[PDB]
Design a protein around this motif. Structure first.
Motif, PDB file in Angstrom:
ATOM      1  N   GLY A  98      49.655 -30.753-114.198  1.00 38.05           N
ATOM      2  CA  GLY A  98      50.758 -31.326-114.954  1.00 38.05           C
ATOM      3  C   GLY A  98      51.387 -32.559-114.309  1.00 38.05           C
ATOM      4  O   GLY A  98      52.226 -33.211-114.928  1.00 38.05           O
ATOM      5  N   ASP A  99      50.970 -32.861-113.075  1.00 38.65           N
ATOM      6  CA  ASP A  99      51.438 -34.012-112.333  1.00 38.65           C
ATOM      7  C   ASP A  99      50.475 -34.209-111.171  1.00 38.65           C
ATOM      8  O   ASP A  99      49.693 -33.310-110.853  1.00 38.65           O
ATOM      9  CB  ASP A  99      52.863 -33.800-111.827  1.00 38.65           C
ATOM     10  N   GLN A 100      50.554 -35.374-110.527  1.00 40.78           N
ATOM     11  CA  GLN A 100      49.988 -35.496-109.196  1.00 40.78           C
ATOM     12  C   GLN A 100      50.887 -34.749-108.217  1.00 40.78           C
ATOM     13  O   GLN A 100      51.984 -34.321-108.571  1.00 40.78           O
ATOM     14  CB  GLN A 100      49.861 -36.959-108.767  1.00 40.78           C
TER      15      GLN A 100
ATOM     16  N   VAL B 182      51.934 -27.984-111.154  1.00 40.08           N
ATOM     17  CA  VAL B 182      51.291 -27.567-109.918  1.00 40.08           C
ATOM     18  C   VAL B 182      52.257 -27.546-108.736  1.00 40.08           C
ATOM     19  O   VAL B 182      51.979 -26.860-107.756  1.00 40.08           O
ATOM     20  CB  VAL B 182      50.038 -28.408-109.602  1.00 40.08           C
ATOM     21  N   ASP B 183      53.386 -28.263-108.795  1.00 38.50           N
ATOM     22  CA  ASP B 183      54.393 -28.131-107.750  1.00 38.50           C
ATOM     23  C   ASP B 183      54.702 -26.662-107.475  1.00 38.50           C
ATOM     24  O   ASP B 183      54.973 -26.283-106.336  1.00 38.50           O
ATOM     25  CB  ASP B 183      55.701 -28.809-108.153  1.00 38.50           C
ATOM     26  N   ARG B 184      54.728 -25.853-108.540  1.00 46.06           N
ATOM     27  CA  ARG B 184      54.976 -24.430-108.407  1.00 46.06           C
ATOM     28  C   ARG B 184      53.656 -23.660-108.289  1.00 46.06           C
ATOM     29  O   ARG B 184      53.425 -22.984-107.290  1.00 46.06           O
ATOM     30  CB  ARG B 184      55.846 -23.934-109.559  1.00 46.06           C
TER      31      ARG B 184
ATOM     32  N   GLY C  72      62.472 -23.869-112.835  1.00 47.92           N
ATOM     33  CA  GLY C  72      62.557 -24.528-114.127  1.00 47.92           C
ATOM     34  C   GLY C  72      61.223 -25.031-114.666  1.00 47.92           C
ATOM     35  O   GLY C  72      61.227 -25.728-115.676  1.00 47.92           O
ATOM     36  N   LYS C  73      60.107 -24.695-113.994  1.00 47.41           N
ATOM     37  CA  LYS C  73      58.800 -25.256-114.313  1.00 47.41           C
ATOM     38  C   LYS C  73      57.814 -24.149-114.680  1.00 47.41           C
ATOM     39  O   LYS C  73      57.672 -23.179-113.929  1.00 47.41           O
ATOM     40  CB  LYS C  73      58.265 -26.031-113.102  1.00 47.41           C
ATOM     41  N   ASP C  74      57.063 -24.348-115.771  1.00 48.45           N
ATOM     42  CA  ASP C  74      55.956 -23.473-116.137  1.00 48.45           C
ATOM     43  C   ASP C  74      54.732 -23.752-115.254  1.00 48.45           C
ATOM     44  O   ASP C  74      54.684 -24.726-114.508  1.00 48.45           O
ATOM     45  CB  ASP C  74      55.591 -23.629-117.616  1.00 48.45           C
TER      46      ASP C  74
ATOM     47  N   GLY D  49      60.864 -40.090-119.998  1.00 48.15           N
ATOM     48  CA  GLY D  49      59.687 -39.257-119.804  1.00 48.15           C
ATOM     49  C   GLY D  49      59.947 -38.000-118.980  1.00 48.15           C
ATOM     50  O   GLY D  49      59.199 -37.029-119.090  1.00 48.15           O
ATOM     51  N   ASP D  50      60.973 -38.040-118.125  1.00 49.42           N
ATOM     52  CA  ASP D  50      61.146 -37.011-117.116  1.00 49.42           C
ATOM     53  C   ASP D  50      62.531 -37.158-116.506  1.00 49.42           C
ATOM     54  O   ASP D  50      62.849 -38.220-115.985  1.00 49.42           O
ATOM     55  CB  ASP D  50      60.065 -37.167-116.044  1.00 49.42           C
ATOM     56  N   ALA D  51      63.351 -36.104-116.578  1.00 49.83           N
ATOM     57  CA  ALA D  51      64.668 -36.156-115.972  1.00 49.83           C
ATOM     58  C   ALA D  51      64.539 -36.394-114.475  1.00 49.83           C
ATOM     59  O   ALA D  51      63.653 -35.846-113.804  1.00 49.83           O
ATOM     60  CB  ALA D  51      65.426 -34.884-116.234  1.00 49.83           C
TER      61      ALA D  51
HETATM   62 NA    NA Z   1      58.735 -33.326-111.246  1.00 57.07          NA
END
Ligand code: NA
Ligand SMILES: C[S@@+](CC[C@H](N)C(=O)[O-])C[C@H]1O[C@@H](n2cnc3c(N)ncnc32)[C@H](O)[C@@H]1O
Ligand SMILES: C[S@@+](CC[C@H](N)C(=O)[O-])C[C@H]1O[C@@H](n2cnc3c(N)ncnc32)[C@H](O)[C@@H]1O
Ligand SMILES: Cn1cc2c(n1)c(=O)n(-c1cccnc1C1CC1)c1cc(Cl)c(F)cc21
Ligand SMILES: Cn1cc2c(n1)c(=O)n(-c1cccnc1C1CC1)c1cc(Cl)c(F)cc21
Ligand SMILES: [Cl-]
Ligand SMILES: [Cl-]
Ligand SMILES: [Cl-]
Ligand SMILES: [Cl-]
Ligand SMILES: [Cl-]
Ligand SMILES: [Cl-]
Ligand SMILES: [Cl-]
Ligand SMILES: [Cl-]
Ligand SMILES: [Cl-]
Ligand SMILES: [Cl-]
Ligand code: NA
Lengths: 380, 380
Positions: free
Chosen positions: A118-120, A275-277, A269-271, B242-244
């Protein structure tokens, strides 16, 4: 050969931690109705205010007023005398859909196992055999001191306590071929919000006798241990009124208390597509599996991702000299035993289940036998 | 003996970094009028909104509308076509005085040198001789890629660029008696917000030829280097839309890119009495002084504090095996050469000067010869 190391923890009513818990209450509320909800919910807290800001795309119908206020109630902020009240605070919502550009690049029209990150970003996992739960003693004790405060608040033993607290533990360690061995507690800090009436001597006595002695084994405490109990001298104003809170501002409390390493990403706060989570949970799972599998006494794992790409871009292992296998050999074992695509991690660690609010105080690791705390039996 | 390591950086228009820069613009505005301002300014950014939340006690008269909008202007968000416009966004302010309870416990009626730490916490400093600026190559290259994007945006070379960007660099390293030696760049990620019209091939070609090749020495790039350029496929929506974004959500980008360690505290929006910033700067200064003084090739320093107490509660040194002195001997050298009370750090590092906005993108360390980057000549 001895050295000091310090870690901190905070309580459920610490304003940053309030935000983490609310963010994860919102996530859980979505997941209870829509297991595939896309959630990126930031929370901000200041006097009288909870603001939700971020991006949610979900089939759920969520009552944000109710979810937020119930989380604050649980924490214990239920009266203006305490500085914050779930019944009467402002709840403001600035939530939009997930960016279509992100959605199309990450998950739209993709097989679940092959969903992109979902992100780098970069993420680390760590484990240490110094405790049975494979966590640093410094951070374990710091968490347990905050949990004890909440217990004695809730059971009415110390009714002058309020929900906002911080603790800090410095341990003196020795080294044994790269493993670390706790010797003694060098310094303890406890700061906790309190009512107007209780005096500093009553509080300091209770914090030593009813909190520290109920948590820290006597074998670690001695005449030289330094105690900084209510060191500010007065902490009546607290919670969001004392200090603005934000989601993702306690990322070291959430993880290893300064040990190991951190890639910077917040959890709450992340599904699972973030990948952070999910990759940090998976990296903890890998690290703990290597230690509990007898391959290492201590180990650090790095992974990294690019947005839209499923497989990690890099994997790295550091064993602190505590394995007879090379780091290269351990990496090969990890690659043979784990699939760190987010769309596979979600299956292995059951990451659509709404258990996230439980993770959002007292650390995400080392407790409750969450899936990432149950080792994988390794083949090699 | 080789291993991979990954670090990331973000651009000036990344929504978290916007918040850091605004928080520090507010700090600088206060310090320009009141060198002793007490500032704890959090910023939140979402579509159309900058919110300031936190605690400021200051004799300054600050026009928050002007300060915020000028910071956003500088970053480059100046039209609704880009997703955010300093001229027309909402600026909301939820700022109060510093808690009297904190003030009395930290600084009220205290000699400046003997001011208490503004909070408890732990902080680390790190330095590595792998670059002349004593920073990890991974993080240096990642920052420079974002700086190059901003340069080519501002000079009109690549006019399709927008301010929001992220980069990530994976380097293959070897080890030499605890020091690390970069060999080659294994993987590069670049994601950058762009206009509607430019196609993916034009962007990817430009990112390789005009960005990567202008930043990364050719000796580190080879036929095996992996490039993930605009890997999401589309990034038109960006910035806060795009992102808070929130202040203090890029703490690893701000420091060592995953190397070393982190104690969890954010830098931006905080005056020097907040040891999260001042003691981290001082710990960098110590680490860099040890490396540039020829005592170590690489070193990690931990310090910790209690709120209201001036002297650190613990100091620890780890030299990765890169000194002929013991860690105990290095600690003695540090104790003889540095005074890490916040009220002394402020003098040594000139921390009432309004230079903080400059620190709030491209990392706080390794550039511009800030005071914490100028080594102390050590006596021993
Ligand atoms: Na983020
Ligand atoms: C010290 S405050 C951070 C600095 C603050 N923003 C300021 O304006 O100076 C950080 C945390 O410390 C705790 N805290 C708040 N007031 C305190 C006090 N009077 N004494 C000790 N700790 C306090 C709370 O947990 C709070 O979230
Ligand atoms: C991917 S977003 C984080 C996830 C997001 N909150 C969500 O709702 O899924 C994190 C950062 O990535 C960048 N970003 C935003 N949109 C992007 C896109 N379409 N492609 C690549 N990167 C993007 C921006 O720098 C943004 O701040
Ligand atoms: C020669 N060598 C290899 C590595 C290394 N130095 C190093 O500093 N880190 C690292 C980074 C951040 C925190 N802690 C550590 C390690 C405890 C030193 C590594 C991390 C990883 Cl995940 C890895 F695989 C290798 C190294
Ligand atoms: C036997 N030993 C002593 C220390 C240590 N293990 C250790 O893991 N860390 C540590 C924590 C986080 C990241 N990186 C490191 C070090 C690179 C290993 C230490 C940090 C400090 Cl500041 C110190 F003084 C000692 C150790
Ligand atoms: Cl805090
Ligand atoms: Cl997110
Ligand atoms: Cl859905
Ligand atoms: Cl144990
Ligand atoms: Cl047991
Ligand atoms: Cl981000
Ligand atoms: Cl603060
Ligand atoms: Cl003032
Ligand atoms: Cl160099
Ligand atoms: Cl030079
Ligand atoms: Na803080």
């Amino acid at each position: 050969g001895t050295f000091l190391f310090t870690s901190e923890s905070v309580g459920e009513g610490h304003p940053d931690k309030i935000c983490d818990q609310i963010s994860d209450a919102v996530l859980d509320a979505h997941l209870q109705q829509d297991p595939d909800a896309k959630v990126a919910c930031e929370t901000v807290a200041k006097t009288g205010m909870i603001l939700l800001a971020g991006e949610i795309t979900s089939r759920a119908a969520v009552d944000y007023q109710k979810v937020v206020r119930e989380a604050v109630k649980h924490i214990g902020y239920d009266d203006s005398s305490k500085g914050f009240d779930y019944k009467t605070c402002n709840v403001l919502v600035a939530l939009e859909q997930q960016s279509p550009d992100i959605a199309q690049g990450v998950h739209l029209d993709r097989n679940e196992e092959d969903i992109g990150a979902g992100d780098q970003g970069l993420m680390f996992g760590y484990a240490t055999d110094e405790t049975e739960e494979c966590m640093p003693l410094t951070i374990v004790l710091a968490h347990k001191l905050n949990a004890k405060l909440a217990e004695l608040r809730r059971n009415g033993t110390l009714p002058w306590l309020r929900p906002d607290s911080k603790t800090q533990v410095t341990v003196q360690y020795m080294q044994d071929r790269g493993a670390v061995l706790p010797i003694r507690v060098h310094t303890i800090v406890i700061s906790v919000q309190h009512d107007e009436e209780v005096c500093l001597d009553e509080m300091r006595d209770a914090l030593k006798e009813k909190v520290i002695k109920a948590v820290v084994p006597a074998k670690y405490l001695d005449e030289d241990t330094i105690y900084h109990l209510q060191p500010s001298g007065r902490f009546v104003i607290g919670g969001p009124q004392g200090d603005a809170g934000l989601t993702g501002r306690k990322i070291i409390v959430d993880t290893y208390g300064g040990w190991g390493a951190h890639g910077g990403g917040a959890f709450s706060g992340k599904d699972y597509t973030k990948v952070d989570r999910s990759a940090a949970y998976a990296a903890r799972w890998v690290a703990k599996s290597l230690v509990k599998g007898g391959l290492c006494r201590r180990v650090l794992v790095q992974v990294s991702y690019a947005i839209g790409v499923s497989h990690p871009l890099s994997i790295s292992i550091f064993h602190y000299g505590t394995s007879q296998k090379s780091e290269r050999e351990l990496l090969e074992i990890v690659k043979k035993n784990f699939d760190l695509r987010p769309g596979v991690i979600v299956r292995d660690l059951d990451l659509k289940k709404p258990i996230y609010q439980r993770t959002a105080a007292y650390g995400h690791f080392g407790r409750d036998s969450f899936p990432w705390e149950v080792p994988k039996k390794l083949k090699y």
